[PDB]
């Protein structure tokens, strides 16, 4: 429909911890925007099943965060593996953005990309090698004019779709607040 090699793929993952070699992906969500950050379509929001032995690696932060959000219950009830989650997400993305064109977009998105390289390389390969990291702009704004940052706030629920929507909203805020293009 609005298929374009200028469209942006936004992605957020939730994990059982910070180490891709030890931990697992338990949620993924994607959004496609056009190049002007208008949201065109939201992709599959997938709680990925993991056995208790993997959930049992979670520290207190992860356990309390992902239990209180309802994600742990959704993970336990899920019948979707990483491979099926890749299949669903690729089938969505192919309708909106060509392979290899969009940088990976999000907040500190290098961390998600590490988990994609390790656990979902077929999905990682769909992105261009570059990164659109909204937190790059956050950090530059904090140093150049930190008063700007008091004008925007995040809920930070660690529900993957809500958090990637907040990533887009943050960049929209920066477009008006710190950019002149
Ligand atoms: Na994130």
UniProtKB/Swiss-Prot annotation:
It comes from the Bacteria. One of its GO terms (molecular function) is 3'-5'-RNA exonuclease activity. InterPro entries: Exonuclease_RNaseT/DNA_pol3, Oligoribonuclease, RNaseH-like_sf, RNaseH_sf. Keywords: Cytoplasm, Exonuclease, Hydrolase, Nuclease. It holds the Pfam family RNase_T. Disulfide bonds: none annotated. It is found in: Cytoplasm. GO terms for biological process: DNA metabolic process. It is an enzyme of class 3 (hydrolase). Its EC number is 3.1.15.-. Residues 8-171 form the Exonuclease domain. The active site is at residue 129. GO terms for cellular component: cytoplasm. The keyword Metal-binding does not apply. Its main location: cytoplasm. Belongs to the oligoribonuclease family. 3'-to-5' exoribonuclease specific for small oligoribonucleotides. This is Oligoribonuclease. It comes from Vibrio cholerae serotype O1 (strain ATCC 39541 / Classical Ogawa 395 / O395). The lineage of its organism: Bacteria, Pseudomonadati, Pseudomonadota, Gammaproteobacteria, Vibrionales.
